[PDB]
Coordinates of C-alpha atoms and ligand atoms in Angstrom, one line a residue:
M179 CA -62.5 18.8 -29.0
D180 CA -63.8 16.7 -26.1
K181 CA -65.7 14.2 -28.2
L182 CA -63.8 11.0 -29.1
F183 CA -63.5 10.1 -32.7
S184 CA -66.5 8.2 -34.1
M185 CA -64.5 6.4 -36.9
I186 CA -61.0 5.1 -36.8
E187 CA -59.2 3.9 -40.0
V188 CA -56.4 1.4 -39.6
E189 CA -53.9 0.8 -42.3
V190 CA -53.4 -2.9 -41.5
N191 CA -51.6 -3.1 -44.8
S192 CA -50.2 -0.5 -47.2
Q193 CA -50.2 -2.3 -50.5
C194 CA -53.1 -2.4 -53.0
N195 CA -53.3 -4.7 -56.0
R196 CA -54.6 -2.0 -58.2
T197 CA -52.7 0.9 -59.8
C198 CA -55.5 3.6 -60.1
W199 CA -53.8 6.7 -61.5
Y200 CA -56.3 9.0 -59.6
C201 CA -55.1 7.3 -56.4
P202 CA -52.1 8.5 -54.2
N203 CA -50.8 5.0 -54.5
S204 CA -50.2 5.9 -58.2
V205 CA -47.8 7.3 -58.0
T206 CA -43.7 -1.5 -44.8
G207 CA -46.2 -3.9 -46.4
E208 CA -48.0 -5.1 -43.3
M209 CA -48.9 -3.8 -39.9
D210 CA -47.0 -5.5 -37.1
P211 CA -49.5 -7.7 -35.3
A212 CA -48.0 -6.5 -32.0
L213 CA -48.8 -2.9 -33.1
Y214 CA -52.4 -3.9 -34.0
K215 CA -52.7 -5.5 -30.6
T216 CA -51.6 -2.4 -28.7
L217 CA -54.2 -0.4 -30.7
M218 CA -56.9 -2.9 -29.7
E219 CA -55.8 -2.5 -26.1
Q220 CA -56.0 1.3 -26.3
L221 CA -59.4 1.2 -28.1
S222 CA -60.5 -1.3 -25.5
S223 CA -59.5 1.0 -22.6
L224 CA -61.8 3.6 -24.1
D225 CA -64.8 1.1 -24.5
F226 CA -64.7 2.3 -28.2
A227 CA -68.1 1.9 -29.8
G228 CA -67.8 3.8 -33.0
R229 CA -66.9 2.5 -36.5
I230 CA -63.6 0.8 -37.3
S231 CA -62.3 0.3 -40.9
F232 CA -59.1 -1.5 -42.1
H233 CA -58.2 0.6 -45.2
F234 CA -56.1 3.7 -45.6
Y235 CA -54.8 3.5 -49.1
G236 CA -54.3 -0.2 -49.3
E237 CA -56.5 -3.3 -49.9
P238 CA -57.4 -4.9 -46.6
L239 CA -58.1 -8.3 -48.1
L240 CA -54.4 -8.4 -49.0
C241 CA -53.6 -8.4 -45.3
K242 CA -52.4 -11.8 -44.3
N243 CA -53.5 -11.3 -40.7
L244 CA -56.9 -9.9 -41.6
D245 CA -59.0 -12.7 -39.9
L246 CA -56.9 -12.4 -36.8
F247 CA -57.3 -8.6 -36.7
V248 CA -61.1 -8.8 -37.3
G249 CA -61.5 -11.5 -34.6
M250 CA -59.5 -9.3 -32.2
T251 CA -61.9 -6.4 -32.7
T252 CA -64.8 -8.6 -31.5
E253 CA -62.7 -9.5 -28.4
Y254 CA -61.4 -6.0 -27.6
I255 CA -64.1 -3.7 -28.8
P256 CA -67.3 -5.7 -29.3
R257 CA -69.4 -2.6 -29.2
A258 CA -67.5 -1.1 -32.2
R259 CA -68.7 -1.5 -35.8
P260 CA -66.2 -3.1 -38.2
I261 CA -66.5 -2.1 -41.8
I262 CA -64.5 -3.4 -44.8
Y263 CA -63.8 -1.0 -47.7
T264 CA -62.4 -3.2 -50.5
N265 CA -61.9 -3.1 -54.3
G266 CA -63.5 -6.6 -54.2
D267 CA -60.9 -8.4 -56.3
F268 CA -60.1 -10.7 -53.3
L269 CA -63.7 -10.9 -52.0
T270 CA -64.8 -14.5 -52.7
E271 CA -68.1 -15.8 -51.1
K272 CA -65.9 -17.7 -48.7
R273 CA -63.9 -14.7 -47.5
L274 CA -67.2 -12.8 -47.2
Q275 CA -68.9 -15.4 -45.0
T276 CA -65.7 -15.9 -42.9
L277 CA -65.2 -12.1 -42.4
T278 CA -68.9 -11.7 -41.5
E279 CA -68.7 -14.5 -38.9
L280 CA -65.5 -12.9 -37.4
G281 CA -67.3 -9.6 -36.9
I282 CA -67.5 -7.4 -40.1
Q283 CA -70.9 -5.8 -40.2
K284 CA -70.5 -4.1 -43.6
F285 CA -68.6 -4.5 -46.9
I286 CA -68.3 -1.5 -49.2
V287 CA -67.1 -2.9 -52.5
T288 CA -65.7 -0.5 -55.1
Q289 CA -65.0 -1.8 -58.6
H290 CA -61.9 0.2 -59.5
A291 CA -59.8 1.2 -62.5
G292 CA -59.1 -1.7 -64.8
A293 CA -60.0 -4.3 -64.6
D294 CA -74.5 -11.5 -47.5
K295 CA -75.4 -8.7 -49.9
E296 CA -77.4 -6.8 -47.1
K297 CA -73.9 -6.3 -45.7
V298 CA -72.5 -5.6 -49.2
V299 CA -72.7 -2.1 -50.7
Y300 CA -71.4 -2.1 -54.3
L301 CA -70.0 1.1 -55.7
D302 CA -68.3 1.7 -59.0
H303 CA -65.8 4.4 -59.5
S304 CA -67.4 6.1 -62.5
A305 CA -59.1 29.1 -53.6
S306 CA -62.5 29.8 -52.1
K307 CA -62.2 26.6 -50.1
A308 CA -59.9 28.6 -47.7
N309 CA -62.8 29.5 -45.5
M310 CA -64.8 26.2 -45.5
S311 CA -65.3 24.3 -42.3
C312 CA -64.4 20.7 -42.0
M313 CA -65.4 18.2 -39.3
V314 CA -63.3 15.3 -40.3
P315 CA -60.6 15.9 -37.7
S316 CA -63.4 16.0 -35.1
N317 CA -64.7 12.6 -36.0
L318 CA -61.9 10.6 -37.6
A319 CA -58.5 9.2 -36.6
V320 CA -56.3 7.4 -39.1
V321 CA -53.6 5.0 -38.0
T322 CA -50.9 4.1 -40.6
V323 CA -49.0 0.9 -40.9
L324 CA -46.3 2.2 -38.7
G325 CA -48.6 3.6 -36.1
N326 CA -48.8 7.3 -37.0
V327 CA -52.0 9.0 -36.3
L328 CA -53.4 11.4 -38.9
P329 CA -56.4 13.7 -38.6
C330 CA -57.8 12.8 -42.1
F331 CA -58.1 10.2 -44.8
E332 CA -56.7 12.8 -47.2
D333 CA -53.3 13.0 -45.5
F334 CA -51.6 10.4 -47.7
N335 CA -48.3 12.3 -47.4
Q336 CA -48.7 12.4 -43.6
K337 CA -48.2 16.2 -43.3
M338 CA -50.2 16.2 -40.0
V339 CA -48.8 13.4 -37.9
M340 CA -50.4 13.9 -34.5
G341 CA -48.4 11.2 -32.8
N342 CA -47.8 7.4 -32.9
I343 CA -49.7 4.7 -31.0
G344 CA -46.6 2.6 -30.6
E345 CA -45.3 5.4 -28.3
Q346 CA -48.4 7.0 -26.8
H347 CA -52.1 6.3 -26.1
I348 CA -54.4 7.2 -28.9
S349 CA -56.6 9.0 -26.5
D350 CA -53.7 11.2 -25.5
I351 CA -52.8 11.9 -29.1
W352 CA -56.5 12.7 -29.9
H353 CA -56.5 15.2 -27.1
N354 CA -53.0 16.7 -27.5
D355 CA -52.5 20.4 -28.3
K356 CA -51.8 19.8 -31.9
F357 CA -54.8 17.7 -32.7
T358 CA -57.1 19.8 -30.5
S359 CA -56.1 23.1 -32.1
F360 CA -56.3 21.5 -35.6
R361 CA -59.8 20.3 -35.2
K362 CA -60.9 23.6 -33.7
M363 CA -59.2 25.5 -36.5
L364 CA -60.9 23.4 -39.1
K365 CA -64.3 23.5 -37.3
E366 CA -63.9 27.3 -37.7
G367 CA -63.1 27.0 -41.4
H368 CA -59.4 28.1 -41.3
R369 CA -58.4 25.6 -44.1
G370 CA -56.1 28.2 -45.6
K371 CA -53.8 28.0 -42.6
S372 CA -53.2 24.3 -42.8
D373 CA -50.7 22.9 -45.4
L374 CA -52.9 19.8 -45.5
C375 CA -56.3 21.6 -45.9
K376 CA -55.6 24.8 -47.8
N377 CA -55.7 23.0 -51.2
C378 CA -58.3 20.5 -50.3
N379 CA -61.5 20.3 -52.3
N380 CA -63.6 18.4 -49.9
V381 CA -67.0 20.1 -49.9
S382 CA -69.4 17.2 -49.1
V383 CA -67.7 15.2 -46.4
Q384 CA -68.4 16.5 -42.9
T385 CA -68.7 20.2 -43.8
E386 CA -71.4 22.7 -42.9
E387 CA -71.5 23.3 -46.7
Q388 CA -72.8 19.7 -47.2
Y389 CA -76.5 20.5 -46.8
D390 CA -76.3 22.3 -50.1
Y391 CA -77.0 21.3 -52.7
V392 CA -78.2 18.2 -54.5
Ligands
LIG644 S1 -58.3 0.2 -55.6 FE1 -58.5 2.0 -54.3 S2 -56.7 2.0 -52.9 FE2 -56.3 0.6 -54.7 S3 -55.1 1.9 -56.2 FE3 -57.3 2.0 -56.7 S4 -58.3 3.8 -55.6 FE4 -56.2 3.3 -54.7
LIG645 S1 -60.3 20.1 -45.3 FE1 -59.7 18.3 -46.5 S2 -57.6 17.7 -45.9 FE2 -58.5 19.1 -44.3 S3 -59.3 17.7 -42.6 FE3 -61.0 18.3 -44.1 S4 -61.1 16.6 -45.7 FE4 -59.1 16.5 -44.6

């Protein structure tokens, strides 16, 4: 559990404009800029050089402080790789060029339920797991609007709060007993033991099982 996370997902805002029935959203608003600043300071103290995204289960382009937050990543963690995951409904050409200049290296746009292109990827939405490994808690930290740290993007209900960055350094949370044993337990495939993982049907995302098939 020594290796730092390679991706951190930050819920800079919790609302999304869509109502996708397949999404946890169906069925506060924005992250305190002070809270985002202490996260930047912590990530800066680690010389963080992995990926950073701005979407948990909300639409980042709805965040009124998005430009500020993106600009701060370039100041605090210029080695990191800022990525926007967005439904695209707010992504005008102007926002795109502005966000790119501020530091975003990639936009992953997903046309969802309803209704710079080198840096734009366009997608369109369109039991026995008890022993499966999973490497997500070894690679990914999630930070919610209120600062809670989760081991996975699946934990919408925050069953596995590892700590809170408003109260503790994210490196210390990442390396605490609870997070360390969890990622070890999931690396060994003990999904059945976790209330988060035991019913999870992730088979392709950071699993040994992923080399097979298709
Ligand atoms: S656009 Fe994405 S985050 Fe928003 S409701 Fe749909 S699936 Fe959920
Ligand atoms: S098994 Fe599922 S819920 Fe558990 S850490 Fe992996 S992806 Fe997340």
